[PDB]
Amino acid sequence: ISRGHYLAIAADCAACHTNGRDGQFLAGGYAISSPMGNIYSTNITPSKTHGIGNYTLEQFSKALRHGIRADGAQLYPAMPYDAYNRLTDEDVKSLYAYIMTEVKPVDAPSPKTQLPFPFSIRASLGIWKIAARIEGKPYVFDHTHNDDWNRGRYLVDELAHCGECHTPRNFLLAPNQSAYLAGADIGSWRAPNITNAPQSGIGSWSDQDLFQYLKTGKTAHARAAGPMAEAIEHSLQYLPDADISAIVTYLRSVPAKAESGQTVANFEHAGRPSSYSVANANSRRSNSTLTKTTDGAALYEAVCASCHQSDGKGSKDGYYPSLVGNTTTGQLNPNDLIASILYGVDRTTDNHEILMPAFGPDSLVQPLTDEQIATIADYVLSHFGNAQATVSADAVKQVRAGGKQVPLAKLAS
Amino acid sequence: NETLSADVVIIGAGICGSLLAHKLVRNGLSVLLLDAGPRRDRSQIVENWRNMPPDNKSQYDYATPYPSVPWAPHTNYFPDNNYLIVKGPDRTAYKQGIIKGVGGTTWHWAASSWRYLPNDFKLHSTYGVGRDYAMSYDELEPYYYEAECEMGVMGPNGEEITPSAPRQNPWPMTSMPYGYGDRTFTEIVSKLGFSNTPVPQARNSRPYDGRPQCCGNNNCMPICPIGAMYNGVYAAIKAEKLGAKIIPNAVVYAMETDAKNRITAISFYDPDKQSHRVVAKTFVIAANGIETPKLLLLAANDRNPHGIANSSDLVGRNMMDHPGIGMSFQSAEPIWAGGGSVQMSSITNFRDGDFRSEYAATQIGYNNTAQNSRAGMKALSMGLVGKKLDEEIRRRTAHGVDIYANHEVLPDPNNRLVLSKDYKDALGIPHPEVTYDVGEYVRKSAAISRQRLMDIAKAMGGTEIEMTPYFTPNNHITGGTIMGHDPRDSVVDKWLRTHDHSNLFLATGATMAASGTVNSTLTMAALSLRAADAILNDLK
Amino acid sequence: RDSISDFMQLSAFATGHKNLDLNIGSALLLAFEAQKHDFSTQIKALREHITKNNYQDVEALDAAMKDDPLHPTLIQIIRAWYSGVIEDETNAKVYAFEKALMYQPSRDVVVIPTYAHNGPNYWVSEPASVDVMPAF
Ligand SMILES: Cc1cc2nc3c(=O)[nH]c(=O)nc-3n(C[C@H](O)[C@H](O)[C@H](O)COP(=O)(O)OP(=O)(O)OC[C@H]3O[C@@H](n4cnc5c(N)ncnc54)[C@H](O)[C@@H]3O)c2cc1C
Ligand code: HEC
Ligand code: HEC
Ligand code: HEC
Ligand code: F3S
User: Fold this and answer.
1) Checking phi first, is residue B205 left (phi over 0); if not, alpha (psi -120 to 50) or beta?
2) Which residues bind heme c 3 (chain A)?
């Protein structure tokens, strides 16, 4: 493929500028759910009327690396232009050539993003950029390290922008470089610690396990879901093996950031040899539409035990993951387990699709309530995952609403 | 309440009613969906089947996991609840199962979604027996495809299986690979001269509609634990998400007709027998081939003394099904039933032919349900202990074979669905009563089918052959409100609208003028979508 | 707990399989005692016969004790462990499904329906031989 096409795949720019499966790609219209509202990605196809067809190289570089449109209006930081701020000039011009040559134009205006006051005016974003300290001298190789480490750092920081989700934000929704890659809460999902910490981060992961997870999202201890599944499916699965190896090499050198209340790695939680009672279920016969089934073990058996086995160790061929020794059930923060139950899993890699059905209110297979989801999650954590984690119905309700509201969003009220 | 007004009101949240409601609410209408039965949870039914006794698993109990409510009871044949009374020489051929609730009897089904042959729509014109449909196969083909895409039907996409229904589009998914039993049966019957071909199933050979791929749980009847197959509760959920109101436990019992014989309102009961009145611009009855004629006959008025839409005296008559002949034996070589769904293939070689002017066309099939429960029960019944018990269980699980042969019955006016004069339910509504006879058509077809089944057993080296001496039901009820062009010889017209009332549609399988050779619910869904088009045309 | 231990050893001898669930065994003992009020005495008599005549396995006990009144109790114990039910009705209590001993001899090939074998297309493989008892 072309160099610009490769850089566009690595930057994952065609995932948020494409409105899902439909919405011919790079036409925009995708609604990113920011804490203040909805931000719509603009038209990117080289249309001379509705797209960026009249963008020069300088204007495209300004939009990509500084968040300024052609007319001078500031771009919302739903653009990772803080991450793209350090792209080399050659990479920027390759991306410009790819946009202006490879992709066909689309003449259809995207929905206008409308944010509540005081976020309505896209002029205070200059103050935000000044406060965030995003500039931003182009990337140069650190000669003290080898080339693989430098390419991995460029991919993680500039192209694949991992820190957009794995680095927590401060009060002003700006990157917190002190807690680099220490995990964050992005909407209803949470990006875990991916530092070199053995117990809290991915330090205890083997190199082959990390490579396999980044290439496919499937590992005996970790399966990608939520934003990670789409990141892998749209961008990471198409990268060369050299790029994934460089990413792993750089990730192994990221300074460790420890969590509070961590003793063992998220994938090192053994399963308690305990389960439900078949006999006790005989009372619940003739009780259609389960509402007297308040037992967590019985609920897991009825809803979850078909695919993940009754002991929670999953299928033998690995299609259904083992909940025992799982990085999602083994996390102290049960956010991702709740999100998995509420929304299921979906990942198309190599034209083959994992799907776990959703079990939220909108489920087609088995709609569960907040209390039932919390009970099942408590059973899973106690018996298969982290025994120190707990789930309440209010936590499930909060995950349903898009996570906890950030303090800054109080200004829009 | 006392108003419950809506643009369209559908009586019955089965697959037909829920699909109709979903299509109607997708097109701007306001829909009120009523169901006599309760709401059901898939996981609760799964728990109920798991705790169902192993003898009820060995012999196919498909109704115990669904509790029967006293106000809207459904049929249970492990110990018989006598809800559906059957009489006649072939009463045993009409003891078929239904489920009442939001989702209906499609809650438990093999999900075999079939298209009828074109000649099945002109049976009388082609062979001189039976009746013709009010519409041709080409008219229902778009609705066939619409139903298949909505439900997600697998199929043998690139394959010249046999003369079958011609397609304009391929199946949404391709049929999943056979298990060991289906491959062995296909080879054996191919050596025997029979064409064993994949069954088109509303199953997931890949993730589809946000639901998982089929992992071969082999419990399609009576409940899928993971949702890798289509249930009408999906259409009900999708319709309710779009604004349709669903009222469970709403047993419709009365209808009011004005001076133009147009339904102005309906009255439905509740578990405490409080009457509620519903007014709408269009009324649809999507209940059953048994419940729809029962409600039509129960709601007789002074304008309609013999029943609603019963001016031709044909409501409840012409009851049809597929009379089957079950058979079980122990194969000489292992078959290992259990890999895949419960019904993965069938012999479709005799679906059509010039013989259909003398005896019925047949469908021969092999049952893919696991034989571990039956093998365990049988080995325990022999008083074996120790290693011999385990060896017997394994051998009978590997060798047990179940075969069936279903036939086509002609629409006979004497196969009726009169209301029972002896039995009533908790609401004082009479129980349904069907007098059933199979006819010389099916009797000759069944002689030939019994010969064929014996041939299949001999080719497999069967032992302990047990062929049922009576005809068995197949649970998809056709006939009762027949369709046609003449108001004096049919109940509904080409668009499933009653000839008596222009305000009433019957989106049910009772409208089909021929039972056909294979399962008949995809035809019911296509007809419901056709009626949806007609209803939208009337109200727009 | 002495009665429960006696029942579990008698069950391990009768079924011939040592790995018997103790909660299923406890429920089975409770239901058997609720059904028969002399069940413990019959268990003690069966164990005394086994330990006195030195029966190597349940085959020898069954062959040498066909006419004794304790044979129905042995057969009932075997059937309750293998099938998970004690009575013979359609509303009988099920004490073991997917852990019942009749689903085990063919478990390596045949599915226990509402629980999944490994993967959505596992059946494209060839099954094992009928003459190989798997495990347990
Ligand atoms: C074991 C089994 C296996 C089957 N296998 C297949 C198969 O392989 N292939 C196939 O094509 N078909 C199969 N069928 C048949 C098919 O799956 C459905 O059962 C049938 O076609 C559903 O018809 P329906 O949607 O019209 O109504 P149903 O789903 O039967 O009932 C619709 C609803 O009507 C409601 N209702 C009834 N009376 C009233 C009233 N007075 N007021 C309000 N609501 C009322 C009920 O509560 C119910 O919810 C099978 C059926 C069974 C039982
Ligand atoms: C870009 C270079 C990367 C890299 C190396 C990783 N991520 Fe993410 N990630 C995101 C979410 C929501 C999750 C949780 C998974 C779940 O919900 O099932 C993850 C998870 C990971 C892991 C696994 C850690 C574990 O203990 O589970 C790893 C190794 C990982 N990521 C690395 C979210 C996102 C993004 C959304 C905006 C983006 C971009 C990335 N991740 C990018 C990367
Ligand atoms: C009952 C409600 C549950 C619960 C609590 C969980 N599952 Fe599943 N699951 C399925 C698949 C296919 C996957 C992974 C993706 C794949 O490999 O393609 C999962 C994954 C999970 C996780 C996350 C594991 C990880 O490390 O991220 C969790 C916490 C989880 N599940 C819990 C498949 C299915 C099902 C299909 C038959 C069903 C039913 C369930 N899962 C049910 C549940
Ligand atoms: C899904 C997240 C996302 C990713 C990844 C992303 N963009 Fe955007 N982009 C946006 C959003 C949102 C905006 C507009 C918000 C604003 O107005 O502040 C935007 C604006 C732009 C603009 C300004 C044009 C205009 O009309 O506003 C350009 C140019 C652009 N993106 C190009 C790119 C390129 C090149 C890439 C790398 C392939 C990329 N984007 C990656 C979301 C994304
Ligand atoms: S039970 Fe479900 S998983 Fe498949 S075999 Fe039947 S559709």
Assistant:
1) alpha
2) 304, 307-308
C23 shares contact with chain A (CB less than 8 Å): yes
CA distance B433 to B84: 6
Kindly report the number of other CB atoms within 10 A of residue A390's CB atom.
13
Number of Cβ atoms within 10 Å of the Cβ of B232: 28
Q: How far is the CA of A356 from the centre of ligand 2 (A)?
A: 18
Closest CA to B515 of B401, B412, B429: B412
Domain spanning A147-251: CATH 2.60.40: no
- Nearest partner of A159 among A241, A58, A88, judged by Cα: A88
Per-position DSSP letters for C106-132, written without gaps between them: TTTTS--TTS--SSTTGGGSPP--TT-
Active-site residue set of B: 476
Q: Which residues contact B483 (CB under 8 A, 6 or more apart)?
A: B133, B134, B490, B491, B492, B493, B494, B496, B511, B512, B513
Ligand 2 near A247 CB (within 6 A) = yes
> Structure solved using which method?
cryo-EM
Query: What residues does CATH 1.10.760.10 cover in chain A?
Result: 279-407
Q: Do C121 and B176 touch (CB under 8 A)?
A: yes
Segments forming the whole domain that contains residue B160: 4-540
Within a 10 A sphere around the Cβ of B420, how many other Cβ atoms? 16
Please tell me the distance from the alpha carbon of residue B406 to that of residue C78, in angstroms, as a whole number.
39
B382-387 CB contacts, 8 Å cutoff, 24+ apart: B383/C75, B385/C14, B385/C58, B385/C59, B385/C62, B385/C74, B385/C75, B385/C78, B386/C16, B386/C57, B386/C58, B386/C59, B386/C62, B387/C16, B387/C59, B387/C133
What total number of domains does chain C contain? Answer: 1
> d(Cα C95, Cα C76) in Å, to the nearest integer?
14
Ligand 3: centre distance to CA A344 (Å): 7
**CATH class of the domain whose range is A3-105:** mainly alpha
Q: Alpha-carbon distance B418 to B84, whole Å? A: 11
Are A376 and A340 a contacting pair, CB within 8 Å? Answer: no
- The CATH homologous superfamily for domain A279-407 is Cytochrome c-like domain (1.10.760.10)
Judged by its nearest atom, the ligand closest to the C-alpha of residue A230 is 2
Identify the nearest ligand to the CA of A26 by its number: 4
For residue C95, the enclosing domain spans 1-136
Using CB atoms, pick whichever of A285, A358, A366 lies closest to residue B41. Answer: A366
Put simply, whether C111 touches A (Cβ < 8 Å) is no
Number of domains in chain B: 1
Q: Whose CA is nearest to atom 2 of ligand 5?
A: B224
